[PDB]
Every structure is written in structure tokens, then in C-alpha cells.
């Protein structure tokens, strides 16, 4: 084997996907979570960090925030010995919580080096990070209740989740709660523009705003969309600017003309015509969730429909979205929704 020399961390990161390449490295790179980032920064000097429960929708900056906080607190050298990270990729049964987590929590804090004490605050406790904590069973969660309180003097717990309701009430009570807000064009445009400028991506006016609107609160999705658009523009090699239409095509948004055709077919009210059109439409591979979202946007915001129609269609759309969230056949659900709307 020829073998390959080890690759430096800087160049390794430079060749990573944009989502990982531009992950926040310190608490100042988190864009729109000041209501919690300010408190976490104040803990750097207060040195009384409480048990934390970060909860929020996908791609809002929870894992990035906890990693940045741990780094700022301990330093590159002392971080490894002061952190115990367990996620959904590891076994986290009641036995694990009772034995391994408890043993780590009971341990004495690793001694900081002289350099670490000169540079980093080095608080007198370690941190256990239970990422994707909503996947843990109720009994395993209950096994943590007294472990958290007994060893608070040397250990602090951080639980991260998307659905706060899956955390048992005692644990939520024990933890200080931090809700991570959805990232939209009004609070995350600066970070996306910075990323675009750093990558010399040329986009028309409003393209980044359109990407953020399509992402629907997920900045990771927006960054991935921007990277895909940049790759397409580079491959084309024409020097032209990225357009909103290209972003919509990359994001799987149904073209407006197809939506108008669907709306007219629904207005017609003929069952067979709607069925045939939907059969043809599902061959394009459009995601049913996107179609339902676009239909909701078209109908709720239209001024040509009365209050009763909107009241009924809102419930119809809610029911269809709930059924789709369970992993159901898209064709059947979309046909049922369209027929029910047509009968309104």
C-alpha cells in the first residue's frame, strides 16, 4: 500500500461540506440565540453553570452551542478529560445510566495544567452531554434524577432535544430550559451572507432570503442549498448570478404553473379528472409535504375565499399533514386531500 500522509486539520476542514466547515467555533459565531448565549457567556465568569436543557427544531445551533461552550470553558487540551458525550448512537439503557454515567459523575475533576489556568477559566466541574436525550426511555431518564442533584458540586448535565415533551417532568424541572428559536430571513440572513461572501458565491438580490424562507427555520438546510447552487453555478462556468428559480428547482418546490393547474382541477370538482391529474403528477416525484405547504400558502392567503371555506380547509390541511407525518403513502393522502378540498 502506498499510504497517505496525515492531513492537517485546517485543510481537512476546508474540504468538508459547508455545514461542517462553517460550524460555529466559539459562542460569538452563534447567530440568533442571544437570549441563551448571553446567559451561557455570563456563566464563564460566574462559574455556576446550572443543568441545561436545550430544546428546539432541527438545525438551530444546539450541538454547536454546547460544543462551543465546552471549548470556551476548558480549552483544547482540558476539554477531553472534562466532557462525557453520549448520543443516540450509543447504548443508553438503565444499566448504562446507573453504572457508567454515575461513575463518570462521581469522579474527581481532572487537574488543569498551569497553562490552562492562565488562559481558560477552568470551572471546578465536568460536563455530561446527553444529545438526542428524547430517545432515552422513561426509566433511564428517571435513573438520572438523584444522580444529577447529588453530584452537582462536580458535575453538570446538558440534555439536548427536539421534542421537549419526551423528557420526563422531574428532569425538565431539574434543568434550566433554553428554547432555540427558528432561524429565518430576519435573524439568520447575516450568517448566510457571510458564508456566501467567504465562498465568493454570486447571487441575485433576494436569493438568500428565498433560500431562508424555503428552509423554514433550518439553517443547515439553507447552507446545503447554497452549496448546491454554488456547485451548479461553478459547473455551468458562465459567471452568471444565481437566481431564485434555480434555488426553487434545487429545493424541490413545485412550479407555480403546476400549482395553478392543481387548483383549477380542484375547482372543477370532477373526481375522475382529479384522479388522473394526480396520477400523472405523482410521476414527477414531488414531495407531498411541499405540495401541502404550497397549497396551504395559496389558499389561506387568497382573498377570493370566504371564512367558512378557509376554516374547513385549515382543518383539512392539518389532518393531511398529521397523517403524512406518520410515514403514509403520499399518493393516497394527496388524492384524499384534493378530493375533500374539491367537495368544499
Amino acid at each position: 500500500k502506498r499510504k497517505i500522509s496525515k492531513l492537517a486539520a485546517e485543510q481537512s476542514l476546508a474540504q468538508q461540506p459547508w455545514v461542517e466547515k462553517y460550524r460555529p467555533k466559539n459562542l460569538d459565531e452563534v447567530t440568533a440565540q442571544d437570549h441563551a448565549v448571553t446567559v451561557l457567556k455570563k456563566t464563564l465568569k460566574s462559574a455556576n453553570l446550572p443543568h441545561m436543557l436545550f430544546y428546539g427544531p432541527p438545525g438551530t445551533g444546539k450541538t454547536s452551542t454546547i460544543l462551543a461552550l465546552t471549548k470556551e470553558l476548558y480549552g483544547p487540551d482540558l476539554m477531553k478529560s472534562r466532557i462525557l458525550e453520549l448520543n443516540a448512537s450509543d447504548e443508553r439503557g438503565i444499566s448504562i445510566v446507573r453504572e457508567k454515567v454515575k461513575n463518570f459523575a462521581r469522579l474527581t475533576v481532572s487537574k488543569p495544567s498551569k497553562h490552562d489556568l492562565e488562559n481558560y477559566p477552568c470551572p471546578p466541574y465536568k460536563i455530561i452531554i446527553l444529545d438526542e436525550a428524547d430517545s432515552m426511555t422513561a426509566d433511564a431518564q428517571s435513573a438520572l434524577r438523584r444522580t444529577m442533584e447529588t453530584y452537582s458540586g462536580v458535575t453538570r448535565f446538558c440534555l439536548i432535544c427536539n421534542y421537549v415533551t419526551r423528557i420526563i417532568d422531574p428532569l425538565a424541572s431539574r434543568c434550566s430550559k433554553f428554547r432555540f428559536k427558528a432561524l429565518d430571513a430576519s435573524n439568520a440572513i447575516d450568517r448566510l451572507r457571510f458564508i456566501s461572501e467567504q465562498e465568493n458565491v454570486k447571487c441575485d438580490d433576494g436569493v438568500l432570503e428565498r433560500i431562508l424562507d424555503i428552509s423554514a427555520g433550518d439553517l443547515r438546510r439553507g447552507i446545503t442549498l447554497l452549496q448546491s447552487a454554488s456547485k451548479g453555478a461553478q459547473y455551468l462556468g458562465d459567471g452568471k448570478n444565481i437566481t431564485s428559480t434555480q434555488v426553487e428547482e434545487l429545493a424541490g418546490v413545485v412550479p407555480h404553473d403546476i400549482l395553478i393547474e392543481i387548483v383549477e382541477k380542484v375547482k372543477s370538482g370532477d373526481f375522475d379528472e382529479i384522479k388522473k391529474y394526480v396520477n400523472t403528477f405523482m410521476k414527477s416525484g414531488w414531495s407531498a409535504a411541499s405540495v401541502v405547504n404550497q397549497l396551504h400558502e395559496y389558499y389561506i392567503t387568497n382573498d377570493n375565499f370566504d371564512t367558512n371555506f378557509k376554516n374547513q380547509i385549515s382543518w383539512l390541511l392539518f389532518t393531511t399533514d398529521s397523517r403524512l407525518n406518520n410515514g403514509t403513502n403520499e399518493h393516497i393522502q394527496l388524492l384524499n386531500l384534493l378530493v375533500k378540498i374539491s367537495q368544499l
Partner: protein
């Protein structure tokens, strides 16, 4: 573990004596009377989270045994193994042997006993009955349905109510004095409202509010600080959203909801909960209105608990409220 000032406020302010437990005057008085005259029975403490059960039992242990209580009581919780073998060996040995240090009776505290298996609970029955002359048991629970009837028959039950307002105010005053903090009356009202009778929530939110101030020495905590740190809707926002839903057209209501949410990045669940609380006080002529409101809002809450599309859920809330209130006309 350098000093007590490096601890979270929830643990830093844990009561040390029964005199520091607030909002449970009946239970505290009764247990103190039992202890004073040596008439302590087997105890069960049933209550919701963060009401003072563990604190109360630890304070009672200190009252009975003193500063060295930890070596004179057998404390087991969910973080420990409490299987049938443990009951047969460790608890049985502790209950049937004299104290090493003193000559008093022996206390066993089974915290979070609702997490114990049925077999262990059944095994505990004859242990409790046989060694009553020299041993007492204290059980702590949040859910009574997990306790076997045989165990319940053998214990005297005390219910820890959700903390009243006055106890929370007095504890907040103590914390403010200790921390050198200023709290506005409206801020205190909002903190008590959001606490829902849990002291841990009050303490965590107060610590976050202190961390949110630029200069805690002179800056005061206002309702705005509370709402910002907790990221919760203000009463004005809830009132405006409800008024728009109940008095405006669909377009205006949708725009108002979106603008209110986007102004401070509010969560739809908080808006739904606040609107439900507001509507609970409405005097409705027709019961069908209330029935539909409750059912549809519960469905929306359950759907939100599993994720989904936020915009569709908000439109569903608007439509459900409008449709339900359409029945009040006739």
C-alpha cells in the same frame, strides 16, 4: 466543589432545616409533632415535582439524628439498584440490626419508590411489618398508581400541594436578599405565573434573569427581562392574537399571528397554552363551543408534540377557534 457559590441556585438554596421549608405548613407541623413526642409512623409523601419532598425528608432526618444523619439512615433512590435481592439482603440487614453510633431507631428512605418493581414492593411488606418496633420507612412518590395497595395500606399518607403564592414570594425575597437583586412587582407576578407551583422553575428562571442583566448590582429585573430570558409570549401578545382571531378576517388574523410570532420568535405551543388559559375564563352561552375548542386544541397540541408543519398548525389553531366561536351566535 470549591464553594457553595459555584452551585446552581436549585441546589444552593436547598432547605437544611424544617423551618426553611415553605408552603407545606400542615405537613411540616404534623411531622414535627410526630417527631417531638416519638410517635413517628411509616410515612408516604406524594406530590408533584419540586414541592419539597426530598428536602423535607432530609430535614426530618437531620432533626432526628443531627449532623451525622447520613451514617444513621438508609437512603435508596432510582439511581440505585433496588431489586428484590437488594430488599432481601441490604434493607433487611439494616432494619434488623442496631445503630452503630447511637441507640435510636432506624430510618429507611425509599426516594422515588414509584420506580420500584412490583416484586420488590411485595417483598417489602413483611420487612415493614416485622421490624416496626425499631425501624421506620419513608416512601416518596409523584405517581401513586405505581404503588401496590399492600404498601399503601401500611403507610400514613401526606400530600404535598403545589406551592402557594405566598411561600414563593417569601422564598424569592430571601433569594433576592442573599443575591443582592431587585425584582419589580410585575416581574414577580410573571415569575409566579410561569412557575406553576414549582420552586425549581422559579430558581432557574431567577438565575437566568440575573445572568441576563448587564449590571446586576443596580439593574432591576422587569417583566421584559423575564419574558426575554424565558422566551415566552407577553400577555399583550396573547390578547392581540386572540382579538385578531375573534374579530378580524382570515388574512388579517394570519398576518397578525405571523407578525406577533416573528417579532420575538415565539413558539406556537406557548401561544396555544396562553390562549387556552385566557379562554378558560370566557362565559360561553353554548357548551358545544367549549367542547370543540378543547377537542381541536388538544389535537393540535398532540400534533405539535410530534413536530410537523408550523404554519399549517397555526392556521389550524385560527380556524378551530373561529369555527368553535361561530356556534355562539345560535
Amino acid at each position: 466543589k470549591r464553594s457553595k457559590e459555584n452551585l446552581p441556585w436549585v441546589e444552593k438554596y436547598r432547605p437544611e432545616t424544617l423551618d426553611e421549608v415553605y408552603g407545606q405548613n400542615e405537613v411540616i407541623t404534623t411531622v414535627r409533632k410526630f417527631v417531638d413526642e416519638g410517635k413517628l409512623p411509616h410515612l408516604l409523601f406524594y406530590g408533584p415535582p419540586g414541592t419539597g419532598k426530598t428536602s423535607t425528608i432530609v430535614a426530618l432526618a437531620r432533626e432526628i439524628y443531627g449532623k451525622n444523619y447520613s451514617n444513621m439512615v438508609l437512603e435508596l433512590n432510582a439511581s440505585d439498584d433496588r431489586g428484590i435481592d437488594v430488599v432481601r439482603n441490604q434493607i433487611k440487614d439494616f432494619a434488623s440490626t442496631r445503630q452503630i453510633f447511637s441507640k435510636g431507631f432506624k430510618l429507611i428512605i425509599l426516594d422515588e419508590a414509584d420506580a420500584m418493581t412490583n416484586a420488590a414492593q411485595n417483598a417489602l411488606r413483611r420487612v415493614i411489618e416485622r421490624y416496626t418496633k425499631n425501624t421506620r420507612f419513608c416512601v416518596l412518590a409523584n405517581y401513586a398508581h405505581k404503588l401496590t395497595p399492600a404498601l399503601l395500606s401500611r403507610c400514613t399518607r401526606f400530600r404535598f400541594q403545589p406551592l402557594p403564592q405566598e411561600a414563593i414570594e417569601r422564598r424569592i425575597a430571601n433569594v433576592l436578599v442573599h443575591e443582592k437583586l431587585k425584582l419589580s412587582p410585575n416581574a414577580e407576578k410573571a415569575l409566579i405565573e410561569l412557575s406553576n407551583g414549582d420552586m425549581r422553575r422559579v430558581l432557574n428562571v431567577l438565575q437566568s434573569c440575573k445572568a441576563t442583566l448587564d449590571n446586576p448590582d443596580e439593574d432591576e429585573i422587569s417583566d421584559d427581562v423575564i419574558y426575554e430570558c424565558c422566551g415566552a409570549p407577553r400577555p399583550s401578545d396573547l390578547k392581540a392574537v386572540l382579538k385578531s382571531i375573534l374579530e378580524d378576517d382570515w388574512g388579517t388574523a394570519h398576518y397578525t399571528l405571523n407578525k406577533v410570532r416573528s417579532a420575538k420568535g415565539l413558539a406556537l405551543i406557548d401561544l396555544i397554552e396562553g390562549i387556552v388559559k385566557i379562554l378558560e375564563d370566557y362565559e360561553l352561552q353554548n357548551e358545544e363551543t367549549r367542547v370543540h375548542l378543547l377537542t381541536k386544541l388538544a389535537d393540535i397540541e398532540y400534533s405539535i408534540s410530534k413536530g410537523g408543519n408550523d404554519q399549517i398548525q397555526g392556521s389550524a389553531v385560527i380556524g378551530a377557534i373561529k369555527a368553535s366561536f361561530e356556534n355562539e351566535t345560535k
